[PDB]
C-alpha cells in the first residue's frame, strides 16, 4: 500500500514538534547547576530533568489532537508519562560505545555511577541502561522514534484520566500510522511494531521503580530542597 495524506501530515507534525523541542547542541546545559562528581549530582540532574519536562510539554502541545483534550486530562497524561518520555527521548544522546548519555562535553557525559550520586540505585539504573541498549539496537527511524513518544504520552491506561474513549481513539490513530509506516517504509520490520509495544511495557516498569525511589528521595527535606518547583509538581502526589 501507500501512506495517506492525513497519516503523512501526522508524521510531519510529530517530527517537526520533536525538532522544535530537542536541541542537538545541548548548549542550554551550561545553564544548569553544574555537575559534581551526599548526592553531589542531584542539583545538576534535577535541573536536567526539569528542563526536559518543559521540552516534553512543548512536544505534547504539538501532538495532533492532544490540545483538544481537557486541561485536566493533558496534565494527568503528562504527569503519569513524563519520566517515560524522558527515558525514551534520552536514547538520542545514549551511546553504545560508552554505555552512557553524552551531551556535548565530558562534563555532560552521564553514566550509571553519576546517577547513583543523585539518589538512585542499581534496582533502577541497571534496567534503565538495558532498556537504552535494547532500544538503541532497534535502529528506529526518526519517524518511528517520535511516533513512539506520542503513543506513550497518549496512553489511556493512566491514573487520573477522565475521557478514556477520546484518548484511546487518538492513540489508536497513532498506532495505525506507526504500523503503516513500519510495513511500507522500514525494510525488515516484520517484528518491529511488536518490539516497540514491548518497550512501552518496559517503560511502565521503569516508571514504577523510579517513582518508588523518587518518593524515598523527595520525602527528605535536605533532598527535596535541591529539586526544582516543576519537578516537585510533576512527580508529586498533589491532586
Amino acid at each position: 500500500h501507500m501512506l495517506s495524506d492525513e497519516q503523512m501530515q501526522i508524521i510531519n507534525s510529530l517530527v517537526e514538534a520533536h525538532h522544535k523541542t530537542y536541541d542537538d547542541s545541548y548548549s542550554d546545559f551550561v545553564r544548569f547547576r553544574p555537575p559534581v562528581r551526599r548526592l553531589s549530582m542531584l542539583p545538576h540532574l534535577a535541573d536536567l530533568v526539569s528542563y526536559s519536562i518543559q521540552k516534553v510539554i512543548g512536544f505534547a502541545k504539538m501532538i495532533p489532537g492532544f490540545r483538544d483534550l481537557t486541561a485536566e486530562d493533558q496534565i494527568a497524561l503528562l504527569k503519569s508519562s513524563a519520566i517515560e518520555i524522558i527515558m525514551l527521548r534520552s536514547n538520542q544522546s545514549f551511546s553504545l560505545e560508552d554505555m552512557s548519555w553524552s551531551c556535548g562535553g565530558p562534563d555532560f557525559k552521564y553514566c550509571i555511577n553519576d546517577v547513583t550520586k543523585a539518589g538512585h540505585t542499581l534496582e533502577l539504573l541497571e534496567p534503565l541502561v538495558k532498556f537504552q541498549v535494547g532500544l538503541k539496537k532497534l535502529k528506529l527511524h526518526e519517524e518511528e522514534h517520535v511516533l513512539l513518544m506520542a503513543i506513550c504520552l497518549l496512553s489511556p491506561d493512566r491514573p487520573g484520566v477522565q475521557d478514556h474513549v477520546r484518548i484511546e481513539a487518538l492513540q489508536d490513530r497513532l498506532c495505525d500510522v506507526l504500523q503503516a509506516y513500519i510495513r511500507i517504509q522500514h525494510p525488515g520490520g516484520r517484528l518491529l511494531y511488536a518490539k516497540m509495544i514491548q518497550k512501552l511495557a518496559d517503560l511502565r516498569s521503569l516508571n514504577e521503580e523510579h517513582s518508588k525511589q523518587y518518593r524515598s528521595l523527595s520525602f527528605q527535606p535536605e533532598h527535596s530542597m535541591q529539586l526544582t518547583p516543576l519537578v516537585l509538581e510533576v512527580f508529586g502526589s498533589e491532586v
Binding site: 518543559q54 510539554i57 486541561a71 485536566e72 486530562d73 493533558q74 496534565i75 494527568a76 503528562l78 504527569k79 518547583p229 516543576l230 509538581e233 510533576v234 498533589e238
Partner: peptide
Amino acid sequence: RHKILXXX
C-alpha cells in the same frame, strides 16, 4: 490544583 502546570 497545580500552580505551574496550569503554563497545560
